[PDB]
DNA sequence: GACCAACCCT
DNA sequence: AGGGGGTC
């Protein structure tokens, strides 16, 4: 049903109204220095398609994109913004972003294109991107006539839906969450990704060579112990050597057949010398293949930086997500892996990396929302919460809390936050189910308000159909009413966990917005680089380091007021690794 | 190209 | 709790 639209040869004044639906199409998944293939505008005066080359050599048009008074509605404005930044062009005045609007309304829907959003409000006059571009190897930009129609249909759909979405957002009391939190956050994220993080490639390469040598050493040793040669990365091949040939005990079974997971092999270490070498092999293999080679692929040879993409509209809890590369899972737990962080360096000379992290934010949030007196009081005293929990479940004095008692108390705390069952805790603490249920029972005696909260929250999700966060983020949990025990059980755990994890997301988001405002007021050159759930990473001049030590934590700490204080720790140094 | 099993992070 | 090579 051909939609009417002008395929313009040049930009005209009536295309630059102070209110428009704009589509700036970037079909590359990774939008960094990626082409723009089409522009559509839809407004009071009609519907228009433009060609980038024309539209972007045009001062009038670029002035308009840049103009903050001229208000745009879009879908995934960060994608457009970053693609335009790589071309030296600024995008401002995005008053409404449908992708973020749909995301707040229902993360479960998985809305990843305009069509998905449109179905939510019964609008079907737009095609799914995957249908116009195909998928995988057949991904292709179409001919002008087909492209032109699709862009305009998305612009047109954005035009039609903004009011319907803002109405529902308002009804959920999520309108401020879109306009004050997520949409501003999108601009800060656009800057972060474009700035990117500088990498020392020679430092990486050297590490690759050392690993290479060590992998060969341990690999040969494995063959020698095995008494033959086999592919160690092959489950089928490794299982045979471990369980048929060396006759090691079959502790666990996979769908495929044999389980060679770490927690399994560690149990088998005593029987044979070959097990410890294999775990080590894999550990090394993992760093070489994922983190050295995978990183060296994505470094941009020109700028010497990696430029991640932060997904703002993906997780079910309101958290961010990072890809190409993921900088939110760089090794930190074992020193061998941790060293990788020495490869991440400031972008200018005489600058330093500055890391700031919240301390036990999830448990602090639980205390606040649960209103547990015993937990509130623990954090007001600034105690060690795991040592404290140990004391309370084991009924002992600080003097008597052994490292094992702590480790155990800690596991209980995570479990409460993830809302696990006696079985899950038993699996984690490697103890009997009865013992696990004794711990939990003890925990709830020590913290009755937390118990009260878990019961009440499951009941509220049952009554309302969703659970909310502090800043009115929302998550629907249909399965909570399901008659299957396992499906219902999982729903209840989400019921318990989401307001904790989700409210923590909200807090750090606000901190990021607040922090940005302060950095500008202060006219500081410091800049945000990464966010890893409970921490922010910046780079700034050595001269600016002392000020940031006061400023960054103050801003993060005052983001919200709760019944307990928030606590931030910081460090800085010449590399990410040294900011410890 | 799609799954599985494995291992990285908060 | 939430994410991010081998085989057929």
d(CA A337, CA A342): 10
Residue A73 CA: distances (Å) to CA of A20, A41, A157, A191: 6, 10, 10, 20
- Residue A43 phi/psi, 5° resolution? -155, -175
Nearest nucleotide over every DNA/RNA strand to the A334 CA, judged by C1' = B8
d(CA A163, CA A176): 15
**What's the Å distance between residue A281 CA and nucleotide B1 C1'?**
29
**What's the Å distance between residue A244 CA and nucleotide C7 C1'?**
21
Nearest nucleotide over every DNA/RNA strand to the A500 CA, judged by C1' = C1
- Residue A98 phi/psi, 5° resolution? -60, -35
Confirm whether any atom of chain B, the nucleic acid strand, is less than 7 Å from CB of A332. yes
Q: How many CA atoms lie within 13 A of A278 on its CB side?
A: 27
Nearest residue to nucleotide C6 when comparing alpha carbons to its C1'?
A234
**What's the Å distance between residue A286 CA and nucleotide C4 C1'?**
14
Q: What is the DSSP string of A263-301?
A: HHHHHHTTT-THHHHHHHHHHHHHIIIIIIIHHHHHSBT
User: Of A241, A245, A273, A284, whose CA–CA distance to A260 is shortest?
Assistant: A241
For the CA atoms of A248, A249, A254, A255, the dihedral, rounded to the nearest 10 degrees, stands at 100
**What's the Å distance between residue A248 CA and nucleotide B7 C1'?**
22
Q: Apex CA A41: angle with CA A40 and CA A43, to 5°?
A: 155
Strand C, nucleotides covered by protein (CB < 7 Å): 1-8
Q: How many CA atoms lie within 13 A of A231 on its CB side?
A: 5
d(CA A527, CA A512): 11
Confirm whether any atom of chain B, the nucleic acid strand, is less than 7 Å from CB of A486. no
Q: Apex CA A360: angle with CA A188 and CA A193, to 5°?
A: 20
d(CA A25, CA A146): 14
Q: Which residues touch strand C (CB under 7 A)?
A: A 231, 233-237, 289, 293, 311, 314-317, 319, 321-323, 326, 328-329, 418-419, 490, 493-494, 497, 501, 533
CB-based contact A25:A36 (threshold 8 Å): yes
Q: Which structure tokens are listed for A345?
A: 């360096």
Q: What is the DSSP string of A232-251?
A: TT-HHHHHIIIIIIS-----
Confirm whether any atom of chain B, the nucleic acid strand, is less than 7 Å from CB of A520. no
Sorted by sequence, the CB contacts under 8 Å of residue A330 that are 6+ apart come out as A291, A340, A341, A344, A576
Confirm whether any atom of chain B, the nucleic acid strand, is less than 7 Å from CB of A138. no
Structural domains of chain A, with CATH:
1-194 (3.30.420.10), 195-309 (1.20.1060.10), 310-360+505-579 (3.30.70.370), 361-504 (1.10.150.20)
**What's the Å distance between residue A151 CA and nucleotide C2 C1'?**
34
> In which element (H, E) is residue A392 found?
helix A385-394
CB-based contact A33:A168 (threshold 8 Å): no
Nearest nucleotide over every DNA/RNA strand to the A138 CA, judged by C1' = B1
Nearest residue to nucleotide B10 when comparing alpha carbons to its C1'?
A533
For the CA atoms of A241, A246, A250, A252, the dihedral, rounded to the nearest 10 degrees, stands at -40
Confirm whether any atom of chain B, the nucleic acid strand, is less than 7 Å from CB of A347. no
Q: Which structure tokens are listed for A106?
A: 């229902």
Method of structure determination: X-ray
């Amino acid at each position: 049903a051909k939609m009417a639209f002008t395929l313009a040869d040049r930009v005209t004044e009536e295309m630059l109204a102070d209110k428009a639906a704009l589509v700036v199409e970037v079909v590359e998944e990774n939008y960094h220095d990626a082409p723009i293939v089409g522009i559509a505008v839809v407004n009071e005066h009609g519907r228009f398609f433009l060609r980038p080359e024309s539209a972007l050599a045009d001062p009038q048009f670029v002035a308009w994109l840049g103009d903050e008074t001229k208000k745009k509605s879009m879908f995934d404005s960060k994608r457009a913004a970053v693609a335009l930044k790589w071309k030296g062009i600024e995008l401002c005045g995005v008053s409404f972003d449908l992708l973020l609007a749909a995301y707040l309304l229902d993360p479960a829907q998985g809305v990843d294109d305009v069509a998905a959003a449109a179905k939510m409000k019964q609008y079907e006059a737009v095609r799914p991107d995957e249908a116009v571009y195909g998928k995988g190897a057949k991904r292709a930009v179409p001919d002008e006539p087909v492209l032109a129609e699709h862009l305009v249909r998305k612009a047109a759909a954005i035009w039609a839906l903004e009011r319907p979405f803002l109405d529902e957002l308002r009804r959920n009391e999520q309108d401020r969450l879109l306009v004050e939190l997520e949409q501003p956050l999108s601009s800060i994220l656009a800057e972060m990704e474009f700035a990117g993080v500088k990498v020392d490639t020679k430092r990486l390469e050297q590490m690759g060579k050392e690993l290479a040598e060590q992998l060969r050493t341990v690999e040969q040793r494995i063959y020698e112990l095995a008494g033959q040669e086999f592919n160690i990365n092959s489950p089928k091949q490794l299982g045979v050597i471990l369980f048929e040939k060396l006759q090691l005990p079959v502790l666990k079974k996979t769908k495929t057949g044999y389980s060679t997971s770490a927690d399994v092999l560690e149990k088998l270490a005593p029987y044979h010398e070959i097990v410890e070498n294999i775990l080590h092999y894999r550990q090394l293999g993992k760093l070489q293949s994922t983190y050295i080679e995978g990183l060296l692929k994505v470094v941009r040879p020109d700028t010497k930086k990696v430029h991640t993409i932060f997904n703002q509209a993906l997780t079910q809890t309101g958290r961010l997500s990072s890809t190409e590369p993921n900088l939110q899972n760089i090794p930190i737990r074992l020193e061998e892996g941790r060293k990788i962080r020495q490869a991440f360096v400031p972008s200018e000379s005489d600058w330093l990396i500055f890391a700031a992290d919240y301390s036990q934010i999830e448990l602090r949030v639980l205390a606040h929302i649960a209103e547990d007196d015993n937990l509130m009081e623990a954090f007001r005293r600034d105690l060690d919460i795991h040592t404290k929990t140990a004391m309370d479940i084991f009924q002992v004095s600080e003097d008597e809390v052994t490292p094992n008692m702590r480790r155990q108390a800690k596991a209980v705390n995570k479990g409460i936050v993830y809302g696990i069952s006696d079985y899950g805790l038993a699996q984690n603490l490697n103890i009997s189910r009865k013992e696990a249920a004794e711990f939990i029972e003890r925990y709830f005696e020590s913290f009755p308000g937390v118990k009260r909260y878990m019961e009440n929250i499951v009941q509220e999700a049952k009554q309302k159909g969703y659970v909310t966060t502090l800043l009115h983020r929302r998550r629907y949990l249909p399965d909570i009413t399901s008659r299957n025990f396992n499906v219902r059980s999982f729903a209840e755990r989400m019921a318990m966990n989401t307001p904790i994890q989700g409210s923590a997301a909200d807090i750090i988001k606000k901190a990021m917005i607040d922090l940005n405002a302060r950095l500008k007021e202060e006219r500081l050159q410091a800049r945000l680089l990464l966010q890893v759930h409970d921490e922010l990473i910046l780079e700034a001049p050595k001269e600016e380091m002392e000020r940031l030590c006061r400023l960054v934590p103050e801003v993060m700490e005052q983001a919200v007021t709760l019944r307990v204080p928030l606590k931030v720790d910081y460090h800085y140094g010449s590399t990410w690794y040294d900011a410890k």
